[PDB]
Amino acid sequence: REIVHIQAGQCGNQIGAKFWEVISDEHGIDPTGSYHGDSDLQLERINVYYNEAAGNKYVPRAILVDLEPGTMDSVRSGPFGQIFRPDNFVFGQSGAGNNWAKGHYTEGAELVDSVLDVVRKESESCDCLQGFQLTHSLGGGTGSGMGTLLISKIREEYPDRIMNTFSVVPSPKVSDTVVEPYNATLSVHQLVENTDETYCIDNEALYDICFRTLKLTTPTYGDLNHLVSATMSGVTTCLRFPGQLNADLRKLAVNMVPFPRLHFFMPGFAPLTSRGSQQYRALTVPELTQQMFDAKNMMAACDPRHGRYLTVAAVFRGRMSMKEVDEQMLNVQNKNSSYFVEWIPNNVKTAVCDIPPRGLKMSATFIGNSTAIQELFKRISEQFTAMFRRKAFLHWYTGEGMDEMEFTEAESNMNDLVSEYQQYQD
Amino acid sequence: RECISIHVGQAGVQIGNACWELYCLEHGIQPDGHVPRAVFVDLEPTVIDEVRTGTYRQLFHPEQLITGKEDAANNYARGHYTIGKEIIDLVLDRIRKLADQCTGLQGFSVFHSFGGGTGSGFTSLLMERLSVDYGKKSKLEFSIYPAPQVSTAVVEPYNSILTTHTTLEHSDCAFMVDNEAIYDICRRNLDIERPTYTNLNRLIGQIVSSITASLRFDGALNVDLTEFQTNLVPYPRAHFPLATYAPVISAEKAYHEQLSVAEITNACFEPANQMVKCDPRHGKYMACCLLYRGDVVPKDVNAAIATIKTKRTIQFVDWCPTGFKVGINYEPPTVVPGGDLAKVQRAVCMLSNTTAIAEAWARLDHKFDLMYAKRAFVHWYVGEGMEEGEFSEAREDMAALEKDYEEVGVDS
Amino acid sequence: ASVKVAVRVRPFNSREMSRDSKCIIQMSGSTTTIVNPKQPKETPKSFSFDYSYWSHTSPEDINYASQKQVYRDIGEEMLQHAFEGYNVCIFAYGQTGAGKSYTMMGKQEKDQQGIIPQLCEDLFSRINDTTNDNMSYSVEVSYMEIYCERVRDLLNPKNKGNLRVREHPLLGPYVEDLSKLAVTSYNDIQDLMDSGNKARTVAATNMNETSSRSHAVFNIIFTQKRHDAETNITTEKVSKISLVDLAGSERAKGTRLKEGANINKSLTTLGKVISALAEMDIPYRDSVLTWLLRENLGGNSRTAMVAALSPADINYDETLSTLRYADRAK
Ligand SMILES: CC(=O)O[C@H]1C(=O)[C@@]2(C)[C@H]([C@H](OC(=O)c3ccccc3)[C@]3(O)C[C@H](OC(=O)[C@H](O)[C@@H](NC(=O)c4ccccc4)c4ccccc4)C(C)=C1C3(C)C)[C@]1(OC(C)=O)CO[C@@H]1C[C@@H]2O
Ligand SMILES: Nc1nc2c(ncn2[C@@H]2O[C@H](COP(=O)(O)OP(=O)(O)OP(=O)(O)O)[C@@H](O)[C@H]2O)c(=O)[nH]1
Ligand SMILES: Nc1nc2c(ncn2[C@@H]2O[C@H](COP(=O)(O)OP(=O)(O)O)[C@@H](O)[C@H]2O)c(=O)[nH]1
Numbered sequence A: 001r002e003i004v005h006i007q008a009g010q011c012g013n014q015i016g017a018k019f020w021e022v023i024s025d026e027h028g029i030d031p032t033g034s035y036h037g038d039s040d041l042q043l044e045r046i047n048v049y050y051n052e053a054a055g056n057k058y059v060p061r062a063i064l065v066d067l068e069p070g071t072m073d074s075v076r077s078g079p080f081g082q083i084f085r086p087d088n089f090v091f092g093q094s095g096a097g098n099n100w101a102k103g104h105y106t107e108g109a110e111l112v113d114s115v116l117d118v119v120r121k122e123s124e125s126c127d128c129l130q131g132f133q134l135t136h137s138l139g140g141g142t143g144s145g146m147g148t149l150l151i152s153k154i155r156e157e158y159p160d161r162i163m164n165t166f167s168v169v170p171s172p173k174v175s176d177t178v179v180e181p182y183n184a185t186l187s188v189h190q191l192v193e194n195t196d197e198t199y200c201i202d203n204e205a206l207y208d209i210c211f212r213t214l215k216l217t218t219p220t221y222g223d224l225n226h227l228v229s230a231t232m233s234g235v236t237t238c239l240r241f242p243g244q245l246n247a248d249l250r251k252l253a254v255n256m257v258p259f260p261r262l263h264f265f266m267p268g269f270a271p272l273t274s275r276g277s278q279q280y281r282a283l284t285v286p287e288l289t290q291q292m293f294d295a296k297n298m299m300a301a302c303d304p305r306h307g308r309y310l311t312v313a314a315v316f317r318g319r320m321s322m323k324e325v326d327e328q329m330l331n332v333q334n335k336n337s338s339y340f341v342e343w344i345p346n347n348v349k350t351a352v353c354d355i356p357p358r359g360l361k362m363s364a365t366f367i368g369n370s371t372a373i374q375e376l377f378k379r380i381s382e383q384f385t386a387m388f389r390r391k392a393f394l395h396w397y398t399g400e401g402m403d404e405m406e407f408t409e410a411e412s413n414m415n416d417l418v419s420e421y422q423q424y425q426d
Numbered sequence B: 001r002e003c004i005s006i007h008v009g010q011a012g013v014q015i016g017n018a019c020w021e022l023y024c025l026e027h028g029i030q031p032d033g034h035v036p037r038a039v040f041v042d043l044e045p046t047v048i049d050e051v052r053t054g055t056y057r058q059l060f061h062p063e064q065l066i067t068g069k070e071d072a073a074n075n076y077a078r079g080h081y082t083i084g085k086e087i088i089d090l091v092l093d094r095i096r097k098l099a100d101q102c103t104g105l106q107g108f109s110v111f112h113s114f115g116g117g118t119g120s121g122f123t124s125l126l127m128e129r130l131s132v133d134y135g136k137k138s139k140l141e142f143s144i145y146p147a148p149q150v151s152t153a154v155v156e157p158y159n160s161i162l163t164t165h166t167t168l169e170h171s172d173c174a175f176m177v178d179n180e181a182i183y184d185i186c187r188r189n190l191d192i193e194r195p196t197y198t199n200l201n202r203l204i205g206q207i208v209s210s211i212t213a214s215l216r217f218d219g220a221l222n223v224d225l226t227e228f229q230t231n232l233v234p235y236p237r238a239h240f241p242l243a244t245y246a247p248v249i250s251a252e253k254a255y256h257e258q259l260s261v262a263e264i265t266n267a268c269f270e271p272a273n274q275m276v277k278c279d280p281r282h283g284k285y286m287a288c289c290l291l292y293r294g295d296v297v298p299k300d301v302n303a304a305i306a307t308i309k310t311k312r313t314i315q316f317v318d319w320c321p322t323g324f325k326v327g328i329n330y331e332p333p334t335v336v337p338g339g340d341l342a343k344v345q346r347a348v349c350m351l352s353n354t355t356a357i358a359e360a361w362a363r364l365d366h367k368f369d370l371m372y373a374k375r376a377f378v379h380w381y382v383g384e385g386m387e388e389g390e391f392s393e394a395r396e397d398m399a400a401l402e403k404d405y406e407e408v409g410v411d412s
Numbered sequence C: 001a002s003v004k005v006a007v008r009v010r011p012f013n014s015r016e017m018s019r020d021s022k023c024i025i026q027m028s029g030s031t032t033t034i035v036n037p038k039q040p041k042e043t044p045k046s047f048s049f050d051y052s053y054w055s056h057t058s059p060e061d062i063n064y065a066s067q068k069q070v071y072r073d074i075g076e077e078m079l080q081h082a083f084e085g086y087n088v089c090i091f092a093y094g095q096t097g098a099g100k101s102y103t104m105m106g107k108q109e110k111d112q113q114g115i116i117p118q119l120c121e122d123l124f125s126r127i128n129d130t131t132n133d134n135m136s137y138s139v140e141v142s143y144m145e146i147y148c149e150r151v152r153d154l155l156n157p158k159n160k161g162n163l164r165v166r167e168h169p170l171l172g173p174y175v176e177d178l179s180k181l182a183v184t185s186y187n188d189i190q191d192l193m194d195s196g197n198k199a200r201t202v203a204a205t206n207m208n209e210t211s212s213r214s215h216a217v218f219n220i221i222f223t224q225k226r227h228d229a230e231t232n233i234t235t236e237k238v239s240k241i242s243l244v245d246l247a248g249s250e251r252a253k254g255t256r257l258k259e260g261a262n263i264n265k266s267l268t269t270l271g272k273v274i275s276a277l278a279e280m281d282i283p284y285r286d287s288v289l290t291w292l293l294r295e296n297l298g299g300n301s302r303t304a305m306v307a308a309l310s311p312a313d314i315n316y317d318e319t320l321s322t323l324r325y326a327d328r329a330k
């Protein structure tokens, strides 16, 4: 099987560097080097993310889409930056304006064809394609607009292969941009209707989870990114490993989406202990479920405790008892019968790889489909209206060839999306 | 004389590798000896690959190892219809190529995992295409039906109410081994909170050895495969008996091993030892095939059973005077060199049809409704060449399986 | 009722004649029973609907449900709901060859016209026979095919390309550049029908057999303008009438993955919508069909479906499936 990553925008891009920083080491691939793999198993399934050309050069099969040179020229001028074949860099030296409209209708719409071109060169690579990984932020141009287009096109070209989306939904407390809800509401819209698996991460849900669950005092972006990339590795790549009970994107999809919206999840990693001290090793297993299922530790902003779950997928990856795994999951399902929805006898989807995260003994990625994420699109949707009402920075959109009915559309859509999700919380 | 076997679904393949292990182990045929007599099907390469990479690597022909690099999908539909279809031909071909090479066979011991994609769906049509190509044989499918509370897949029931209805009108005798109810045995009758799948497999890998292996093997009271279905199914519904083993004692902890027949047989009817969460909560047995192996005196049996026939609290069906098929083999069991199985010199792999499953099916049917009641993951099948028909019409199916297993009992 | 459901069984067709098929369907009152040809000694499965139309024989038969009867029970009351100011929908659902097109458009001759021409004729008849200077009307029509998520304008021979359904940020979904024609008479709207029906079965349509794989949607925008002499001003009342001839329910072998996917998705979604509507006493965007007709499927709207049934034994599985689908509509 296979997949082809997609680094839309700067963020989605910045993260690319971290997702590939990791993944590679979790596959023994040095900058341009080959497979130094401490083992021999980190190779029989690599294909999922690379391509064979030389014999020591397995190049990441991702796409780097962005209308701001400097960015990709920071990712390509640093560490692992020199492993991507230049063909991968689909830049847009234009003005990468922070407008969803500027990267979806006017500026991005041009650079698109020169992207799809490659997304096809990579898809028609070899063997059988599974789906595409998509990273980006719903709070900017090259991210929400242009990346949200990249998919609307992808999903017309292969409505068969899957589409996981890793979105950095606009954090609450403080917005790292101003129109944010504009660029956001507009991209979520496109998401709820193309990709079929979305993993929403919040820069501040991370800080928290990174400053209190990792006594880490100076959580640089690199970190946040790093933590995130840690989860997306547990998801995909991982399951493309052996296991007593293994799954793969689809299983994950076909066990997690009760209703076609596409629904968005909230990823959570397992061993998340501070370096030295904490290295408690309390990782027998009840310790991992202890972790994963708590409020804090959910990369999302919202707290599960604020709304039932529809599905859950503990994708563990480290030798354990299909008994102490299958078992724990249960008590968990009974101690919290309250929030776990009922019309699904077994919400949880236990998954079990074998080999764990390179240096760790036992981990377990969590992919939750809780109704709690209602209280986020609400947020976003609110911010919109409060500012849409006055058409705040709307001239930067319309003036870019947009529509007063376009914004209406998205909000509503994504706004209805909130509605539905409640239809199950009840 | 023989009995081919088709291990379908990752699980049916893991269990397969296991049951297949125990085999050579008690036949003195190391890694590289003769030639198996089965096949392996899966729509996820990486798993059958485990049989291609791991142990018992060269004991198979890359011809009896079928794979569909494509996608597994934990959904019946896709595995049965859409994808699973493409492979079937090829699959069949082997069970027609392997079915020819032999000499007057008896049937195909099928190994699948009820609630899976490749295991539920696919087989559904595999057994389907068999019942027509060899209606004149035995179709005993050995299943691992849905843990009563510890299921895995979110949809499981969708996949198991569908493998039951499609296979029902095609199997001869469906053996059932409950994944969870086997754990209990690993906790309560062997002690270990560290049971790897690789163990449950060693277990069924045992109970199964008692079925084919040893039985098709000479003895003081041989029992052919046909024998089963005959002495085991009272009615055409591909009736599903339950597998049970007796000396499930730990090869470390306790040691009373020397547990004469009189004991090991009583240890079969206590509900805490039956590889199935179908505790005889009321289910009246209606036929049991006590397969013994090792040093056993026919009188010991034709007495140990007599004592039972008169315990009454073990209430057998009405319309059934005597429902005890005593199968005696010679060669004692054969435990893994150093797993965790005791290793006695006699065992009792008793299987049976019990009005008990009236439960197990019930509890699994109900599940289904809850979700169907909201269509839950329905769009996943529809979009895979299925319809509101196949679901609703396979629900009605089992409905008359809840009435069937009710009527054939509880009444006189 | 906001949701009415009727089933209708037709006479044997040619395939069934050449097959010497037995009739497995019988009707009584509102009940339709179906016999399993492989199990003649059972009691047939029973189903109850708002109407079970027995049209398995012919108009020469005293008990034959004619085009006129079907229209007067289902179509007539719908038109009345449109005159009252609200939107309506009438769907024909069922296996290819079961009778969907015959029920909706029917034949061009005397006696065989379906719901669409009878409803249009009735509409203009009520309009022209409306006596009142304060009441004037406008009738606009659109006729299209929904195939693989794309729209085909049946009233424009050179429909150059495949128009998309779009969602106006405020006024709802609509088909871009789709022609909407104002008609002032029946013979005129009749002209458009014939012209559109013609386009559905030209030779080129056999390439992708769009006559049985696409959904045909006939839309009428009915506007009633009310004048008032006291304080001199008109108040407009707009009703939307959608008459649909769905894709064959069996294509939900030889069917392409994506045609089947979309058709299944479309029919499955429509089923949820209608069951929800009947519930009330909803995933619209899940399919283009249910998305484009959202406004005609709202809580105010009224819907009716006529499920076409083959009588023969050879179609037991598809016919049972259709009956179950209709039974779920509620
Ligand atoms: C001596 C020793 O055992 O060191 C550990 C360690 O101290 C701890 C604290 C690690 C450490 O992780 C962090 O401090 C961290 C920093 C930024 C963001 C997130 C986490 C570690 O850096 C991370 C590193 O993780 C791995 O090696 C995994 O394979 C992981 N790899 C990466 O994230 C990675 C990092 C740099 C370069 C390339 C990859 C992984 C996890 C999931 C999927 C794929 C890969 C491990 C076990 C450790 C150190 C090295 C200190 C922990 O994290 C992980 C992801 O394992 C933090 O809590 C856990 C518990 C570990 O015990
Ligand atoms: N006893 C036993 N049960 C197993 C084993 N592997 C899986 N199972 C059980 O069988 C079911 C899992 O089926 P899956 O592995 O998801 O799927 P599959 O049937 O192989 O086919 P796909 O869904 O297409 O992958 C669960 O109920 C597991 O508990 C095994 O090795 N032994
Ligand atoms: N986790 C994370 N968030 C980022 C990174 N870079 C920008 N962001 C977030 O992305 C949003 C800004 O969008 P940006 O990526 O600049 O848009 P674009 O570059 O125009 O497509 C803010 O909410 C930031 O917190 C990053 O490297 N990691």
Ligand SMILES: Nc1ncnc2c1ncn2[C@@H]1O[C@H](COP(=O)(O)OP(=O)(O)O)[C@@H](O)[C@H]1O
Binding pocket: C009, C010, C011, C013, C055, C056, C094, C095, C096, C097, C098, C099, C100, C101, C102, C103, C212, C248, C308
């Ligand atoms: N009630 C009826 N009376 C007479 N002819 C009918 C009737 N219903 C269907 N038919 C005939 O059966 C065929 C199938 O109907 P259409 O052709 O309506 O198929 P579908 O259901 O695929 O749209 C046509 O030839 C039509 O003339």
Ligand SMILES: [Mg+2]
Binding pocket: B009, B010, B011, B042, B044, B047, B072, B118
């Ligand atoms: Mg599998």
Ligand SMILES: [Mg+2]
Binding pocket: C100, C101, C102, C211, C212, C245
């Ligand atoms: Mg037609």
